[PDB]
Design a protein around this motif. Sequence first.
Motif, PDB file in Angstrom:
ATOM      1  N   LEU A   3      47.267   3.478  24.578  1.00 41.09           N
ATOM      2  CA  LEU A   3      48.426   3.202  24.252  1.00 41.09           C
ATOM      3  C   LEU A   3      48.572   1.864  22.751  1.00 41.09           C
ATOM      4  O   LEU A   3      49.184   2.527  22.297  1.00 41.09           O
ATOM      5  CB  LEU A   3      48.908   2.084  25.264  1.00 41.09           C
ATOM      6  CG  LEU A   3      49.381   0.253  25.355  1.00 41.09           C
ATOM      7  CD1 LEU A   3      51.230   0.790  25.327  1.00 41.09           C
ATOM      8  CD2 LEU A   3      49.200  -0.836  25.860  1.00 41.09           C
ATOM      9  N   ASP A   4      47.312   2.163  22.695  1.00 37.74           N
ATOM     10  CA  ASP A   4      46.672   1.219  21.862  1.00 37.74           C
ATOM     11  C   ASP A   4      46.714   2.409  20.393  1.00 37.74           C
ATOM     12  O   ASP A   4      47.774   2.312  19.655  1.00 37.74           O
ATOM     13  CB  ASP A   4      45.463   1.250  21.664  1.00 37.74           C
ATOM     14  CG  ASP A   4      45.079  -0.065  20.566  1.00 37.74           C
ATOM     15  OD1 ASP A   4      45.661   0.113  18.922  1.00 37.74           O
ATOM     16  OD2 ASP A   4      43.948  -0.693  20.675  1.00 37.74           O
ATOM     17  N   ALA A   5      46.519   3.649  20.491  1.00 40.21           N
ATOM     18  CA  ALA A   5      46.381   4.198  19.422  1.00 40.21           C
ATOM     19  C   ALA A   5      48.072   5.075  19.515  1.00 40.21           C
ATOM     20  O   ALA A   5      48.976   4.946  17.732  1.00 40.21           O
ATOM     21  CB  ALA A   5      45.709   6.338  19.317  1.00 40.21           C
ATOM     22  N   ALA A   6      49.153   4.915  20.298  1.00 39.55           N
ATOM     23  CA  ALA A   6      50.082   5.954  20.518  1.00 39.55           C
ATOM     24  C   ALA A   6      51.108   5.168  19.668  1.00 39.55           C
ATOM     25  O   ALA A   6      52.580   5.172  18.875  1.00 39.55           O
ATOM     26  CB  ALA A   6      50.927   5.867  22.197  1.00 39.55           C
ATOM     27  N   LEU A   7      50.990   3.289  20.339  1.00 39.40           N
ATOM     28  CA  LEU A   7      51.824   2.717  19.319  1.00 39.40           C
ATOM     29  C   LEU A   7      51.097   2.076  17.272  1.00 39.40           C
ATOM     30  O   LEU A   7      52.057   1.758  16.403  1.00 39.40           O
ATOM     31  CB  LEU A   7      51.817   0.990  20.035  1.00 39.40           C
ATOM     32  CG  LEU A   7      52.233   0.359  20.923  1.00 39.40           C
ATOM     33  CD1 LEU A   7      53.848   0.367  20.123  1.00 39.40           C
ATOM     34  CD2 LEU A   7      52.855   1.912  21.752  1.00 39.40           C
ATOM     35  N   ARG A   8      49.857   2.557  17.520  1.00 37.41           N
ATOM     36  CA  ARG A   8      49.250   2.611  16.428  1.00 37.41           C
ATOM     37  C   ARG A   8      49.686   3.419  15.222  1.00 37.41           C
ATOM     38  O   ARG A   8      49.600   2.587  13.647  1.00 37.41           O
ATOM     39  CB  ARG A   8      47.658   2.053  16.914  1.00 37.41           C
ATOM     40  CG  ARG A   8      47.126   1.993  15.616  1.00 37.41           C
ATOM     41  CD  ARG A   8      46.460   3.923  14.105  1.00 37.41           C
ATOM     42  NE  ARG A   8      45.882   4.843  15.040  1.00 37.41           N
ATOM     43  CZ  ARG A   8      44.837   5.722  14.561  1.00 37.41           C
ATOM     44  NH1 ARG A   8      45.832   5.655  12.981  1.00 37.41           N
ATOM     45  NH2 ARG A   8      44.165   6.255  15.295  1.00 37.41           N
ATOM     46  N   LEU A  92      61.450   0.363  12.433  1.00 33.38           N
ATOM     47  CA  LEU A  92      61.344  -0.826  13.343  1.00 33.38           C
ATOM     48  C   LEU A  92      62.195  -0.553  14.927  1.00 33.38           C
ATOM     49  O   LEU A  92      61.674  -0.035  15.607  1.00 33.38           O
ATOM     50  CB  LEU A  92      62.080  -1.669  12.516  1.00 33.38           C
ATOM     51  CG  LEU A  92      61.853  -3.356  12.907  1.00 33.38           C
ATOM     52  CD1 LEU A  92      62.643  -4.575  11.737  1.00 33.38           C
ATOM     53  CD2 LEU A  92      62.804  -3.659  14.431  1.00 33.38           C
ATOM     54  N   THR A  93      63.375   0.320  14.228  1.00 34.63           N
ATOM     55  CA  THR A  93      63.598   0.702  15.738  1.00 34.63           C
ATOM     56  C   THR A  93      63.364   1.650  16.647  1.00 34.63           C
ATOM     57  O   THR A  93      63.239   0.879  17.831  1.00 34.63           O
ATOM     58  CB  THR A  93      64.924   1.178  15.632  1.00 34.63           C
ATOM     59  OG1 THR A  93      66.530   0.499  14.569  1.00 34.63           O
ATOM     60  CG2 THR A  93      65.882   1.450  16.001  1.00 34.63           C
ATOM     61  N   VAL A  94      63.119   2.495  15.761  1.00 31.31           N
ATOM     62  CA  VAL A  94      61.567   3.311  16.764  1.00 31.31           C
ATOM     63  C   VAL A  94      60.924   2.867  17.285  1.00 31.31           C
ATOM     64  O   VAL A  94      60.397   3.196  18.685  1.00 31.31           O
ATOM     65  CB  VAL A  94      61.016   4.722  15.596  1.00 31.31           C
ATOM     66  CG1 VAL A  94      60.463   5.646  16.616  1.00 31.31           C
ATOM     67  CG2 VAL A  94      62.394   5.623  15.496  1.00 31.31           C
ATOM     68  N   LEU A  95      59.739   2.061  16.831  1.00 37.77           N
ATOM     69  CA  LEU A  95      59.164   1.024  17.940  1.00 37.77           C
ATOM     70  C   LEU A  95      59.493   0.663  18.669  1.00 37.77           C
ATOM     71  O   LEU A  95      58.897   0.557  19.900  1.00 37.77           O
ATOM     72  CB  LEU A  95      58.088   0.275  17.037  1.00 37.77           C
ATOM     73  CG  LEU A  95      56.569  -0.702  17.071  1.00 37.77           C
ATOM     74  CD1 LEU A  95      55.562   1.045  17.489  1.00 37.77           C
ATOM     75  CD2 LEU A  95      56.606  -1.502  16.091  1.00 37.77           C
ATOM     76  N   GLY A  96      60.828  -0.585  18.605  1.00 38.39           N
ATOM     77  CA  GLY A  96      61.294  -0.936  19.249  1.00 38.39           C
ATOM     78  C   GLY A  96      61.716  -0.473  20.932  1.00 38.39           C
ATOM     79  O   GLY A  96      61.680  -1.057  21.590  1.00 38.39           O
ATOM     80  N   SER A  97      62.525   0.595  20.540  1.00 36.15           N
ATOM     81  CA  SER A  97      62.748   1.942  21.534  1.00 36.15           C
ATOM     82  C   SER A  97      61.613   1.740  22.312  1.00 36.15           C
ATOM     83  O   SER A  97      61.260   2.317  23.352  1.00 36.15           O
ATOM     84  CB  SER A  97      63.581   2.436  20.625  1.00 36.15           C
ATOM     85  OG  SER A  97      63.898   3.916  22.059  1.00 36.15           O
ATOM     86  N   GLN A  98      60.313   2.136  22.273  1.00 37.40           N
ATOM     87  CA  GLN A  98      59.176   3.048  22.231  1.00 37.40           C
ATOM     88  C   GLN A  98      59.292   1.488  23.488  1.00 37.40           C
ATOM     89  O   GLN A  98      58.223   2.208  25.006  1.00 37.40           O
ATOM     90  CB  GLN A  98      58.234   3.616  21.695  1.00 37.40           C
ATOM     91  CG  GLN A  98      58.703   4.714  20.867  1.00 37.40           C
ATOM     92  CD  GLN A  98      57.363   5.388  19.991  1.00 37.40           C
ATOM     93  OE1 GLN A  98      56.521   4.693  19.980  1.00 37.40           O
ATOM     94  NE2 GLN A  98      57.321   6.414  19.866  1.00 37.40           N
ATOM     95  N   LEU A  99      58.219   0.174  22.465  1.00 41.80           N
ATOM     96  CA  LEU A  99      58.128  -0.361  23.860  1.00 41.80           C
ATOM     97  C   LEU A  99      59.048  -1.361  24.629  1.00 41.80           C
ATOM     98  O   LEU A  99      58.918  -1.343  25.814  1.00 41.80           O
ATOM     99  CB  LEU A  99      57.993  -2.148  22.820  1.00 41.80           C
ATOM    100  CG  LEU A  99      56.564  -2.035  22.205  1.00 41.80           C
ATOM    101  CD1 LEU A  99      56.279  -3.312  21.096  1.00 41.80           C
ATOM    102  CD2 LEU A  99      55.776  -2.235  22.652  1.00 41.80           C
ATOM    103  N   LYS A 100      60.266  -0.804  24.725  1.00 33.78           N
ATOM    104  CA  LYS A 100      61.054  -1.408  25.338  1.00 33.78           C
ATOM    105  C   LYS A 100      61.215  -0.485  26.616  1.00 33.78           C
ATOM    106  O   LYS A 100      61.502  -0.651  27.961  1.00 33.78           O
ATOM    107  CB  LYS A 100      62.852  -1.509  24.343  1.00 33.78           C
ATOM    108  CG  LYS A 100      63.626  -1.677  26.410  1.00 33.78           C
ATOM    109  CD  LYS A 100      65.351  -2.380  24.498  1.00 33.78           C
ATOM    110  CE  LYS A 100      66.543  -2.378  26.117  1.00 33.78           C
ATOM    111  NZ  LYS A 100      67.293  -2.770  25.007  1.00 33.78           N
TER     112      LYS A 100
END
Lengths: 107, 50
Positions: A3-8, A92-100
């Motif tokens: 998770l850390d690297a995928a979000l990183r 920002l949108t891509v990161l938010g979509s992944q987190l959601k």
Amino acid sequence: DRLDAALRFQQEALNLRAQRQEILAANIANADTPGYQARDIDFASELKKVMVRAVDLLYRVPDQPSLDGNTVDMDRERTQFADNSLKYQMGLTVLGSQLKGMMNVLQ
Amino acid sequence: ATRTLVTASTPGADMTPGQLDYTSRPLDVALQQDGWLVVQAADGAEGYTR
């Protein structure tokens, strides 16, 4: 780590976009001072280096001389600023979509 | 290189002699085509006039 690297990856891309935005805003605010050289960072190469990792900014070629020694061109800087803002919002949108999606998986 | 500033400039002068009138005063003089009367300037160095 997982998770850390995928979000990183996206986090580092967003941070690099923010730093480039800071540099662009600095050299736009300083656009009317003699003896100033426009600066920018090679976004693609810098991101590639950081992904496998204090940024190495480099000068921008002038397009038409000015006696006072200013090399920042307002139209080019504005276009680059708009492009960087759009890229930042896209990341920002891509990161938010992944987190959601990750949050919704747990439901 | 596109921008090309412009600055004003003045060459020395024009040496065409002016029109002269006859006042019959005993000690009024007019020079030739390239004449110059020498006078002592304020600083001391000699100068030329007409």
